[PDB]
Design a protein around this ligand. Structure first.
Ligand code: PLP
Ligand code: PLP
Lengths: 284, 283
């Protein structure tokens, strides 16, 4: 089971319920969150994630998060996990609008074991299918009210999209816009390799900006790799030398099969795993 | 505010109920329904329990045990009716449960009807059209998007309303990418034209409104033609009346659309009466 740490720094008893029945995180999915990886005694890219928490909170008209109190709760939760186990941990920051009719927002951090599915996805890779998201490429900017760039607690469709792919024998999904441009995964950001330069869809599309992807581009640029944001199509995916689904939890999952077509492997696949490994510890 | 779990416990409202890893708060993974408590009973209970079943099927949630839900609704209702003669906002919460645990989370909750609802029934709302971002063939050609389910993931619905609130608008009418009228973030859109009532078809990426369906049933019985049609923004303005229909805000007439003040029509008073009779057709 998991560990809970409120921003007061108090660690919760394992069995005690925390949230009220009228908390807007549960009644309306009204809140924002972030996911952190605990590896080798510390959480990875803490500050980069707290900046996205601020950007998500700003988009959601939530009180601006108090970073000194969040940092302390992360440090306390981290020290409890690494004390209990040497395994990697899944750290989550939950930031809700609070109870209904009550102004105090709900905030706590939570660490849980890393699911075994990610260890296989890192190890073996994934098979993915392309799905039409339904949004055009101008969705994130021309329609700001749709808050597509925010990591909200309203993940029902993302989970349903994965359930749909599971029934099709696929391990993940790549969303594509109505006009045919690659968007993102339901829980990951798409990164491409070509000829050496690494490409990902631009962030002004109706997609999130990935903390892992940004840290990946920064180290890759420092090591001599040209990185750039371009509009990608499904054909560009198949003509590539590699496809990855990058995320804070699943560091780098290579897409070995896309829509039933097996994609060939490239020597670049082993170095890519090193880059994300080096990326998530760039803050250290 | 009263909470009644399906386990049969009538709980204190301020006592915490949910765990920190409950998927309703961690991922919004669940379904819900909202019912109005009026004159000693909840309105259109069976129609609401049927959509709860339909929402759970789209969400791969366990098939709801309706006898247990009926008891939780009847118990929660009668405790409200005992405390007050006021109308109540009763909602049923049905989540996938905790992480790594197979038991789904289920409970009923009653709260007072907000004052916003009392004004909207009396005076109506001003609404703006907004691009939903989905095309009109979105609900069918993209079944994975579960657009037809009343899910706990309303972050966009609430964010869309805050956006309209900052512009001085009281509600929103979603419009598809190709320009078809969809629904409201919390309501079903109904139009009047010449004595004819129209609503968007349910195969669009929209919910099926329990109130609108009951409205069509009563309206047809009293001689009014009702039908499902594809509407465009022009159809709204050439209409004789626009309403946002929902279980709590029974019928909110749109008095201002995209800044254009819309005049009142004799059908407007009849429209309010029909919805009143519809929500008690099961009685
Ligand atoms: C969390 C998430 C990502 C990846 O974000 P990271 O900061 O890199 O972990 C990508 N897409 C979606 C939809 C997400 O929710
Ligand atoms: C709840 C809801 C409605 C109306 O549903 P009723 O069963 O009539 O109350 C309409 N549109 C949306 C988006 C809703 O969530």
């Amino acid at each position: 089971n998991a560990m809970v740490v409120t921003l007061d720094g108090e660690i919760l008893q394992p069995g005690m319920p925390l949230l009220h029945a009228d908390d807007l995180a549960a009644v309306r999915g009204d809140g924002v969150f972030e996911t952190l990886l605990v590896r080798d005694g510390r959480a990875c890219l803490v500050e980069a994630h707290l900046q996205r928490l601020t950007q998500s909170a700003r988009l959601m008209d939530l009180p601006e998060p108090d970073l000194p109190r969040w940092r302390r709760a992360v440090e306390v939760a981290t020290q409890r996990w690494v004390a209990s186990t040497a395994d990697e941990g899944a750290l989550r920051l939950i930031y809700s609008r609070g109870r209904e009719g009550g102004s105090a927002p709900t905030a706590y951090v939570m660490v849980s074991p890393v699911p075994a599915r990610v260890i296989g996805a890192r190890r073996d890779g994934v098979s993915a299918i392309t799905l039409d998201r339904g949004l055009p490429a101008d969705g994130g900017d021309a329609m700001p009210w749709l808050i597509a760039s925010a990591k909200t607690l309203s993940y029902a469709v993302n989970m349903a999209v994965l359930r749909h792919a599971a029934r099709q024998g696929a391990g993940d999904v790549i969303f594509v816009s109505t006009d045919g441009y690659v968007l993102e995964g339901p829980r990951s950001t798409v990164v491409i390799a070509t000829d050496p330069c690494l490409l990902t869809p631009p962030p002004w599309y109706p997609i999130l900006r990935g903390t892992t992807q940004q840290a990946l581009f920064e180290v890759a640029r420092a090591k001599g790799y040209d990185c750039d944001y371009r509009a990608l199509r499904v054909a560009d995916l198949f003509d590539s030398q590699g496809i990855w689904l990058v995320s804070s939890m699943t560091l780098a999952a290579r897409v070995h099969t896309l829509d039933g077509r097996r994609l060939p492997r490239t020597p670049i696949a082993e170095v890519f795993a090193e880059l994300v490994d080096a990326a998530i510890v760039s803050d250290r």
